[PDB]
Amino acid sequence: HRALDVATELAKTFRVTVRERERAGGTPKAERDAIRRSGLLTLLISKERGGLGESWPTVYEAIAEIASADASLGHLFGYHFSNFAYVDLFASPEQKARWYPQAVRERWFLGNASSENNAHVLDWRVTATPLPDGSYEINGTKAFCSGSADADRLLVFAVTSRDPNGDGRIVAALIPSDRAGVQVNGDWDSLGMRQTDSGSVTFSGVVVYPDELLGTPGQVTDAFASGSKPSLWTPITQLIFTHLYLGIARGALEEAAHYSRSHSRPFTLAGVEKATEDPYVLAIYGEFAAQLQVAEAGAREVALRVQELWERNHVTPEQRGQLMVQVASAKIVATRLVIELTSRLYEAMGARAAASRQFGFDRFWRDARTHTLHDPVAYKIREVGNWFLNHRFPTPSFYS
Amino acid sequence: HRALDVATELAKTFRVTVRERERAGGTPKAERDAIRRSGLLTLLISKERGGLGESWPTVYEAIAEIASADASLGHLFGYHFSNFAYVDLFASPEQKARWYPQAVRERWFLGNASSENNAHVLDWRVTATPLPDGSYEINGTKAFCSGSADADRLLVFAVTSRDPNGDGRIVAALIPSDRAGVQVNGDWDSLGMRQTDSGSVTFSGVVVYPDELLGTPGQVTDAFASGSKPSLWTPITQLIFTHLYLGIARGALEEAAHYSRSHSRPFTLAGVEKATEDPYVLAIYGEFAAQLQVAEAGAREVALRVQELWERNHVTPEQRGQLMVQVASAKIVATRLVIELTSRLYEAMGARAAASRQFGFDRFWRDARTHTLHDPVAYKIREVGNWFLNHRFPTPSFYS
Amino acid sequence: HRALDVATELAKTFRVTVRERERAGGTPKAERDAIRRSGLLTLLISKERGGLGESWPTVYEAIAEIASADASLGHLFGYHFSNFAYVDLFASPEQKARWYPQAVRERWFLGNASSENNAHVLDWRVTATPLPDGSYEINGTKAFCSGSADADRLLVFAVTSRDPNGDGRIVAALIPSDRAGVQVNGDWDSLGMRQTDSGSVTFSGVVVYPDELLGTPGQVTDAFASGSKPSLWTPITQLIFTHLYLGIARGALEEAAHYSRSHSRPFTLAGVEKATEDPYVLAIYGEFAAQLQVAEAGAREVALRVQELWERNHVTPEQRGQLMVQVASAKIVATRLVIELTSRLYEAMGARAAASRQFGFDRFWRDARTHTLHDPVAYKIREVGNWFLNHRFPTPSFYS
Amino acid sequence: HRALDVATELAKTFRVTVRERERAGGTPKAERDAIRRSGLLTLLISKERGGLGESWPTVYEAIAEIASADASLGHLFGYHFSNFAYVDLFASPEQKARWYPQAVRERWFLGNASSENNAHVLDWRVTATPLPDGSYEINGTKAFCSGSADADRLLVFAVTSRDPNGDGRIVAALIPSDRAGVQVNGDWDSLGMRQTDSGSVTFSGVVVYPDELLGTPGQVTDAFASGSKPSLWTPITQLIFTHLYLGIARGALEEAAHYSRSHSRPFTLAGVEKATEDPYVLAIYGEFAAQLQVAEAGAREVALRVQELWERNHVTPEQRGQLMVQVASAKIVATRLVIELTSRLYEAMGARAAASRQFGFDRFWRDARTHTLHDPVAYKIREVGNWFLNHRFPTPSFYS
Numbered sequence A, B, C, D: 001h002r003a004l005d006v007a008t009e010l011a012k013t014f015r016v017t018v019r020e021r022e023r024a025g026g027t028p029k030a031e032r033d034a035i036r037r038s039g040l041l042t043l044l045i046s047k048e049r050g051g052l053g054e055s056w057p058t059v060y061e062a063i064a065e066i067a068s069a070d071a072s073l074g075h076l077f078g079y080h081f082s083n084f085a086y087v088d089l090f091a092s093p094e095q096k097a098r099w100y101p102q103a104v105r106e107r108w109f110l111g112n113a114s115s116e117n118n119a120h121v122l123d124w125r126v127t128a129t130p131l132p133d134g135s136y137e138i139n140g141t142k143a144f145c146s147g148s149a150d151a152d153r154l155l156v157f158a159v160t161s162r163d164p165n166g167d168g169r170i171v172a173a174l175i176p177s178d179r180a181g182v183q184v185n186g187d188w189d190s191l192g193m194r195q196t197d198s199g200s201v202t203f204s205g206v207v208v209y210p211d212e213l214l215g216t217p218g219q220v221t222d223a224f225a226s227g228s229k230p231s232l233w234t235p236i237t238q239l240i241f242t243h244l245y246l247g248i249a250r251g252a253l254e255e256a257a258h259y260s261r262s263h264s265r266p267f268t269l270a271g272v273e274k275a276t277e278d279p280y281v282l283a284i285y286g287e288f289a290a291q292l293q294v295a296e297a298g299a300r301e302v303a304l305r306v307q308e309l310w311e312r313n314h315v316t317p318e319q320r321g322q323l324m325v326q327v328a329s330a331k332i333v334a335t336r337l338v339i340e341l342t343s344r345l346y347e348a349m350g351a352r353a354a355a356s357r358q359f360g361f362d363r364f365w366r367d368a369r370t371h372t373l374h375d376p377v378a379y380k381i382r383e384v385g386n387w388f389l390n391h392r393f394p395t396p397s398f399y400s
């Protein structure tokens, strides 16, 4: 229970200052260094390599706990583990032996530069052109690069260009954020998630060496199309997002409840003597706490299944498909829950909870409302419907 | 897995005939006898006493499976385990050493006569008059006596009367359904749950012998008041109801999807070519399938905790209260899900699914609409809200 | 107020017997004759021609009031006016001069035979083949022929075949229901709307004469595509459906309230002394009555606009499209309301309202759930959204 | 039509600057002066007295129009008419003969100081101490004094103290905001409604002269208890709030639609090519636009009834109660609509609508979420339920 106690203490510390920090935006450097000092960035690194030797259920619980205190830090922490998962699923034994002890000693906090701001999510224009001796050169701009500021290593994706062994192949690499030609742009000014540093990143002639490549170019496409073990990356990552939404939900419900207990006035016009005994206040808390209990219990079960399949040598298409359906279902339910709860709970607190902007309760809705648009919930709903009605598992990809 | 395989095969046979049987109402004797021959009524009896020595997770899964095929049979089966749970929590070791091998040998299917139709659910008027030899005489009429027809034993509740040691004290007993003076009235004629035989039972001078009594007078009240282990009866039973709702929900979704694949016509007016590719059909299946996956996953966690506390020698009010809150939340979510989907799934099927009465899909809504009224979900919502906001566990009762 | 008083009195009488009549299904001949005697079938015929010279707001109010007592009689009554509206929009001056006094004298109650059960709703295969002197012969089977039993005249639609003047043109005619070769099949057996007689009708060599044709073959296609005055038929008819749903909603709300005042028990476990003072019972009635008040007030405005445009010589595409959008909006809101309310009101009444099948409250949900599937509400929603987002009015058709 | 054209033009100009102005908060002096110059503040003053002699339907439509551009200015404009309505309902004919020509000539924009921040609403501590001449000395601080800054007159409420003719009676008056001892505090820093100046006002020995008093002490209480014409103030004012919510809803829908047409990217992962043709985007717009059409149509009818009763010399409790129920119903529907729509419309726009804080669409949710808490919608729901189920009209008060 030690790692979770560490995460709980981190979250308590983050609650004290999140109101003022999130207003200013920018990089939460002091808090990222506290996470570095905590050791939790090493949860999934084996003890033999210097890490904590912990499991995915612990990682998910820590993500939700931190997210309940500070959604931007929960996002950054969770995305670190999405990046780590990708690295771990493709790294060679040589790379793990070098990188993981280094990640412990240098306290790596991983960032990524993957998505782009073109015509659609599939229009990728960051290229990797081959160099002598097996290196590549990266050129172009990436968007929504969560945790790219103050990241020690960047997980980067590019498409092979002018490549004699095949253009259009997806290359992934793990490079130092201070490699020449890498420019983090710090242009993140959002409604919520205001400290995630999810702005754009530009690559000018950036060299990637062979010992930084995560598999051969195109290997990710083969692993996903085949259902190899790396196809677990998408359910793992979407369950990370699910735990952000559940953490935000619980944080909002608990903060509202503290307000109601200490500050809400009874509607004596209707004969109520105490706001905490009002039947409609109690009904609001009961409706949302009930949905949260069921969603949290369901999320714990799916997290245990993530761990189970993580440990297998091979995951069948049925096992991976079933997991992806369970994860998508959890994310759908958590998305609806957090969006509704963070808005409707004002009705349990009363007008003064909005009349003083500084109370800051709208941070929960602003964070949830921003992040949940990460990928459209309508098409997660369509994928679950296509599975149930047509017996079609989602196609493994970066989004399903 | 053997036990769940047997339940799955039972459910398959019940699906073949449920549409015809439930119209008639009345007692599903052949199907009750099939359940008797299956051995599953002995799921929770230890192997040492001739039973299967299985766990509550298996019982709850079996309940949902059967209920997905025939909600009345799922109800009869589930209430048998509610009755069994009461006996197990209150009978002496000496009584259980006699009753349980007899229940196995005689293939006992339990019913109950407990609630009444007076001014409100607390108002009980069926009396137990003490006789000099330690026996009691029972007089009065009970309502909603599920499984009272064809029952090998009835779990019966009465309040003491003409009692020098105190009137109004609740006594419970397990008695043969054909004991002199017991009249099963056969007046069950309901919207849904049409074969549960939940009619009235009239007791005329019915003798109860000392070795048929479950505890002492008022003992159930004392156990409720102290939140001790016998008060687990309520979360156990409320979780039985939850699994009826999850089972009905799954059955309705599967039956609707079969119609959507086989008979629904594409809305060509809007350019649709296949109903199974219609975006709004797919969204209905996705939304409800997603909520069902999360609810079923959370329900499995709560069932594991039921088993945990069932095996304990002592249970504290905090353990019992936390379990009751988790059960209540599961019941709330399942109630809303089943009531919504059994009505809205018609929109995924089309007009002819209702215009052809013989299709009989309305059975799912009728069954769920009837059963979910067992006790008011508004007060399960209040109970979860009072816990979350005011840190007050539900007051243990026959309902909470 | 005379006409509305007559409809109110009719509805009063229908309420006495609807519970018994709709169980049996079949043709409500006695009630149809009571409507004939009332004169209300002539509401839209000018006094000059022997009718009442009333307005569409009166028709719509009468439809909703009758539907609140008996949805099948409300449906038959309303569809009579959809049939009359089609006739009035396409009939020649000499057809009106002959038919309308005859409809008054003979107390005509109209039915129709229009839709079919082929691959999709566009797919019409009942043929009209030329005969000498401009007559046509009709062959094939129609489905969903509301009011086709006991009909004085049938509005029938067919597609021309082996026609020198052009194949595949839609022809419409108003013919006697007992003409040789017309076989009303009497096969309506529905979940709800059980006395609308909406079964199939088979046409074997049925002769239609030129003086029974409603415009030339294909004229309806041209009138809808061009937005000439007959394009009002669809918003008129969809608003008829809307008033069926509002009528059912009001009838259900009022019937539930009577049960709650008379029979519901207080939940004394939570300290409630009277069910009519329960905060959650009150919230259910308040939610649904509030939405009903708004929906009804909105529907009055749209019905007035129907009358205003009905009196216009020419209606622009803006005026027709805005009306169709207002009608579709009213129908969407009414559909959601009646489907939710007819199911959720059980929670304000209690278990015994469902456990005693004879109470028959489920008739409201059965009727509403059946009729609201007439055409898919998802595509009414799309039509309103296409208008608001893209400024595209719905393409006029039999559906929009 | 001229007045509404003027309001539409005002709203056009407000939309240009609202994003920048509402961020700063404070007093929108230039825009208040634009409203002064428009003459619309005199809409309800008779032409005889120099006003526009217009109707409440015109006022309500102008309130919604302005609120759709700038919710704070719509609120200020709307509350001006609430203040005016109170004056008209309680002022003597002689008072109006002086005040209304002055309000025209001096372009009065009214504010109020009425509510307070004590243990519960209606727990009032601002006192009125009688002076020998019939004046009152006012002492205390008022809360939520909308429009208190830059107000030409304040409508003020106090409770009598040290009063031989009875303590605790409510007095009301209309006084200059620069009367000696009046301090408008400017302490308003809110989530939304950021330019309504709803801070506190402190009265230090403020003398109120006899010709400024509105009625006699406790007359407002007696009017409420009688349900007589002056108690129309509450339904009038609650319908003002309703039109704020309908205006915010319409403004949010149109602003979102503009973004969707201009900036939303199609989700090619699913094969869609234009965001404005996405089936789920279209469903969101259609669902909310449909609900909005019906709500707006219904609100127009209730506004016509406000005008009817406003022109009567006497109003019965039944007429007032029926109107209050209709107003409560409109408020309930509008509240639910605006709160859902201002949050869910992000799903129709996509992530970049929230990633760019400066888009500023969250203003609609912040404004609606703040104002809808004015009084709890849960008790409007109970009030409508108590009327429908128990035939009890709402108890007249400042809130019902």
Ligand SMILES: Cc1cc2nc3c(=O)[nH]c(=O)nc-3n(C[C@H](O)[C@H](O)[C@H](O)COP(=O)(O)O)c2cc1C
Pocket (backbone or CB within 6 Å): A079, A112, A113, A114, A115, A116, A121, A143, A144, A145, A146, A147, A193, A196, A198, A370, A371, A373, A374, A375, D265, D349, D350, D351, D352, D353, D355
């Ligand atoms: C708060 C937030 C954080 C995001 N973080 C990442 C990220 O770390 N890596 C990535 O590839 N995309 C990230 N995305 C991008 C989304 O996956 C997606 O590309 C984007 O939301 C599409 O925007 P649209 O809906 O306007 O088309 C993020 C998006 C949001 C809103």
Ligand SMILES: Cc1cc2nc3c(=O)[nH]c(=O)nc-3n(C[C@H](O)[C@H](O)[C@H](O)COP(=O)(O)O)c2cc1C
Pocket (backbone or CB within 6 Å): A265, A349, A350, A351, A352, A353, A355, D079, D112, D113, D114, D115, D116, D121, D143, D144, D145, D146, D147, D193, D196, D198, D370, D371, D373, D374, D375
């Ligand atoms: C934006 C806003 C403006 C308000 N303006 C006024 C006002 O002008 N006059 C008034 O008496 N109350 C005003 N109120 C207050 C309500 O009457 C009520 O006192 C308050 O909303 C209750 O606060 P609570 O729910 O936190 O207990 C306003 C409230 C809000 C939220």
Ligand SMILES: Cc1cc2nc3c(=O)[nH]c(=O)nc-3n(C[C@H](O)[C@H](O)[C@H](O)COP(=O)(O)O)c2cc1C
Pocket (backbone or CB within 6 Å): B265, B349, B350, B351, B352, B353, B355, C079, C112, C113, C114, C115, C116, C121, C143, C144, C145, C146, C147, C193, C196, C198, C370, C371, C373, C374, C375
């Ligand atoms: C109760 C009911 C009555 C109907 N009455 C008629 C009718 O009178 N004339 C007609 O053309 N269609 C009628 N329809 C049919 C619709 O036009 C449409 O063909 C049908 O609902 C589509 O069926 P589907 O959703 O199963 O494909 C009726 C449908 C229902 C449910």
Ligand SMILES: Cc1cc2nc3c(=O)[nH]c(=O)nc-3n(C[C@H](O)[C@H](O)[C@H](O)COP(=O)(O)O)c2cc1C
Pocket (backbone or CB within 6 Å): B079, B112, B113, B114, B115, B116, B121, B143, B144, B145, B146, B147, B193, B196, B198, B370, B371, B373, B374, B375, C265, C349, C350, C351, C352, C353, C355
């Ligand atoms: C389908 C159904 C089955 C029921 N079976 C039982 C039962 O077996 N034993 C029992 O004590 N109560 C049973 N109940 C009754 C509830 O405990 C409760 O008394 C009843 O639902 C309250 O009815 P009311 O809401 O109309 O007041 C049953 C209720 C329903 C609806």
Ligand SMILES: c1ccc2c(c1)sc1ccccc12
Pocket (backbone or CB within 6 Å): B079, B082, B083, B112, B114, B115, B155, B237, B398, B399
């Ligand atoms: C109140 C009292 C006893 C019981 C209920 C409600 S449901 C049920 C099911 C089985 C056995 C007893 C009881």
Ligand SMILES: c1ccc2c(c1)sc1ccccc12
Pocket (backbone or CB within 6 Å): C079, C082, C083, C086, C112, C114, C115, C155, C157, C237, C398
């Ligand atoms: C397609 C074509 C004709 C008709 C429908 C659908 S519903 C209806 C109701 C009355 C008369 C004609 C029609």
Ligand SMILES: c1ccc2c(c1)sc1ccccc12
Pocket (backbone or CB within 6 Å): D079, D082, D083, D112, D114, D115, D155, D237, D398
């Ligand atoms: C309680 C008492 C007075 C008032 C409210 C609530 S809102 C409002 C708006 C304008 C004028 C007076 C009041």
